From a paper:
The cytosolic sulfotransferase (SULTs) family catalyzes the transfer of a sulfate group from the universal 3′-phosphoadenosine 5′-phosphosulfate (PAPS) donor to a wide variety of acceptor molecules bearing a hydroxyl or an amine group. Sulfonation results in inactivation of the majority of acceptors, including neurotransmitters, steroid hormones and drugs, thus modulating their biological activity and rendering the product more soluble and readily excretable. Of these, the SULT1 family is the largest and is responsible for the sulfonation of phenol, thyroid and steroid hormones, as well as a variety of xenobiotics and known drugs. For example, SULT1A1 displays substrate preference for small phenolic compounds, while SULT1E1 shows a preference for estrogen acceptors.
We determined SULT1A1 structures in complex with PAP and one or two molecules of the 3CyC acceptor (SULT1A1-PAP-3CyC1 and SULT1A1-PAP-3CyC2, respectively). The SULT1A1-PAP-3CyC2 was probably formed due to drop dehydration leading to increased 3CyC concentration. These structures allowed us to examine the changes undergone by SULT1A1 upon binding of one versus two 3CyC molecules. Our SULT1A1 structures in complex with one or two 3CyC molecules provide new insights into the structural basis of SULT1A1 substrate inhibition. Comparison between the two structures shows a dramatic movement of Phe247 allowing the exposure of a conserved binding site for the second 3CyC molecule. Our determined SULT1A1 structures in complex with one or two 3CyC acceptor molecules indicate that the formation of the binding site for the second 3CyC molecule (3Cyc-2) is probably induced upon binding of the first molecule to the enzyme active site. In contrast, kinetic analysis of the activity towards 3CyC indicated no inhibition at high substrate concentrations for the WT and the mutant proteins. WT SULT1A1 exhibited a much higher KM of ∼20 µM for 3CyC, relative to the pNP, in accordance with the role of SULT1A1 in the sulfonation of small phenolic substrates.
Numbering used by the authors: 7 to 295
Write the structure that this text describes.
């Protein structure tokens, strides 16, 4: 098998190479002017990464094409054979740095909280996440075999997928936001009103840009622009690692398209389980626009 099993670390199932990567990651030192992009997988990481990097380049799109987003925004825990690790990439990254992770809080380098690093967190509704992830598993060959949609959806509801439970991830980081600087966004809000969300990000990172530059960012962070941009669309990675003919990384970009995959039986079982897991939480997600 080329698709190795998940390895559990402190309760969290992880890609095996990412588990190994936690070793060198232990020596990682955060700076006070770092910013961390944190998400459960498939919730808009790449989207918000492109947004934050354009802001960092003061809107200059030629600066944003300097390299693929994975090299401009180092992925902390990342590693795979014949690809440079997130830690190796990080050492050539100039400050102020943007950093990406999907780690639950129980694996997050303590340095990031100690240093009070600003967090941009993005949450997305669980149903869209699930569908997105199922397809991602097929094209991104470091994951184990996804199986049928039905058996993947059952694993997703118990957290037996890479990075574990969606339900715990979005709650723990929601709770963290009351004691650490976290801007907590929803993919759906960004779909609804991208300009509004970008203005929130701007206020959060303490920058100012003219209306015209903001409007130029909305354009270049749209699904369509990001899909054809080879610096955001992951098409330059080796086909041994991601195969786009199986499923593109920039797949649909919709809120609400889970309706086209979930059967009615799956939906009813998912809803009942979801109300149990999310009962004590004050988060309200939108499943569609
Ligand atoms: N500019 C954009 N607008 C809306 N969705 C975007 C986007 N850029 C990427 N995405 C979507 O974000 C999801 C992947 O997120 P991550 O970057 O966290 O892996 C994919 O969702 P779909 O598979 O629903 O299309 C991808 O298509
Ligand atoms: N193989 C593989 C990959 C897994 C992966 C997991 C999470 C993520 O945010 C990005 C990723 O990019 C990859 O190329």
């Amino acid at each position: 098998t080329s698709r190795p099993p998940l390895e559990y670390v402190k309760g969290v199932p992880l890609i095996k190479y990412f588990a190994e990567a936690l070793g060198p990651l232990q020596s990682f030192q955060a700076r006070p002017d770092d910013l961390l992009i944190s998400t459960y997988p498939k919730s808009g990481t790449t989207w918000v990464s492109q947004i934050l990097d354009m802001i960092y380049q003061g809107g200059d799109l030629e600066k944003c094409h300097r390299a693929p987003i994975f090299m401009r925004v180092p992925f902390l825990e990342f590693k795979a054979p014949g690809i440079p690790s997130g830690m190796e990439t990080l050492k050539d990254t100039p400050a102020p740095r943007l950093l990406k992770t999907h780690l639950p809080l129980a694996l997050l380098p303590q340095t990031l909280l100690d240093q009070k690093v600003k967090v941009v967190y993005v949450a997305r509704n669980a149903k869209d996440v699930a569908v997105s992830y199922y397809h991602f598993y097929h094209m991104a060959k470091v994951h184990p075999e996804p199986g049928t949609w039905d058996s993947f959806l059952e694993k997703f509801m118990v957290g037996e997928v890479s990075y574990g439970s969606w339900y715990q991830h979005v709650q723990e980081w929601w709770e963290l936001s009351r004691t650490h600087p976290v801007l907590y966004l929803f993919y759906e809000d960004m779909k609804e009103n991208p300009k509004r969300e970008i203005q929130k990000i701007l206020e959060f990172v303490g920058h100012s840009l003219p209306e015209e530059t903001v409007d130029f960012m909305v354009q270049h962070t749209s699904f369509k622009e990001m899909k054809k941009n080879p610096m955001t669309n992951y098409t330059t990675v080796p086909q041994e690692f991601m195969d786009h003919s199986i499923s593109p990384f920039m797949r649909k970009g919709m809120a609400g398209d889970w309706k086209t995959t979930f059967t009615v039986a799956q939906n009813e079982r998912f809803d009942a389980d979801y109300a149990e897991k999310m009962a004590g939480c004050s988060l309200s997600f939108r499943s569609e626009l």
